[PDB]
Design a protein around this ligand. Structure first.
Ligand SMILES: CCn1c2ccccc2c2cc(C(=O)NCc3ccc(S(=O)(=O)CC)cc3)ccc21
Length: 259
């Protein structure tokens, strides 16, 4: 590539990300005074473990659906073969959401936006996976300390998705070329904006792996305890990405073909 081509890459990633945001940043900032009462928190903790899991998996699936749309609008993603598109989404959709999630987190009061209002991690006690929850909160805290801009989140989440080290890729070099181009783009925008100091503060890639792995493992425990709940009330797409052997569902293929 070259300079104008890299700066055009920057604008197009930023555009693709704006169009496939679930929630505008300003909508989430305007809502930060809107915080679950202690009575509403108590109501969340008294919800059954299985209904809370169903509600969280539903919200997570909705978030993942915008990540699929981000990828379909991302330069060069749709020139990749369908196997590689699917491998990249299967490994990275959760990761992209974990990163996008820091926009919904308030580091002043350590709350996250959830079902209309903001609540600390005690909101999620009924899940019985406090470790996974505090890790997600800790991770979102550390990303909020960096004061990402929206443009930076778009360029970083594009690299989270386009990772040429995902096992199972069939055109690894083609993904490597794509990755390298987005890294140049990311790093060029940081240099232009005097923000390269964040490079050494970004999370190691192992951290995102670790968070997804925790998620999948707690899902497995839960699915052993409530196998019919998962079968009957979790979203098909969620099951395709996260449970075993839930990829009998082929939703991603459908999402990727549909214009
Ligand atoms: C860490 C606690 N925790 C979970 C733990 C386990 C499973 C699911 C969740 C979970 C889901 C949400 C959620 O989906 N809330 C609505 C929402 C909409 C748009 C945005 S966004 O615009 O930043 C783009 C994704 C952000 C949040 C929030 C917090 C959550």
């Amino acid at each position: 590539a070259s300079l104008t081509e890299i700066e055009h890459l920057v604008q197009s990633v930023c555009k693709s990300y704006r169009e496939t945001c679930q929630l505008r940043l300003e909508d989430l900032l305007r809502q930060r005074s809107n915080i679950f009462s202690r009575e509403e928190v108590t109501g969340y903790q008294r919800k059954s473990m299985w209904e809370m899991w169903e509600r969280c998996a539903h919200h997570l699936t909705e978030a993942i659906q915008y990540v699929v749309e981000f990828a379909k609008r991302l330069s060069g993603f749709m020139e990749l073969c369908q196997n590689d598109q699917i491998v990249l989404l299967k490994a990275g959709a959760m990761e992209v959401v974990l990163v996008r999630m820091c926009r919904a987190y308030n580091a002043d009061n350590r709350t996250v936006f959830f079902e209309g209002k903001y609540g600390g991690m005690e909101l999620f006690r009924a899940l019985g996976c406090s470790e996974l929850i505090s890790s997600i909160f800790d991770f979102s805290h550390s990303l909020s300390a960096l004061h990402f801009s929206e443009d930076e989140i778009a360029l970083y989440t594009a690299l989270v998705l386009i990772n040429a080290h995902r096992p199972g890729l069939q055109e690894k070099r083609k993904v490597e070329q794509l990755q390298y181009n987005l890294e140049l783009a990311f790093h060029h925008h940081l240099c232009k904006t005097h923000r390269q100091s964040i490079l050494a503060k970004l999370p190691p890639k192992g951290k995102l792996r670790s968070l997804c792995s925790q998620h999948v493992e707690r899902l497995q425990i839960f699915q052993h305890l409530h196998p019919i709940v998962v079968q009957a009330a979790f979203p098909p797409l969620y099951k395709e990405l996260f449970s075993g052997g839930g990829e009998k569902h082929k939703i991603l293929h459908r999402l990727l073909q549909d214009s």
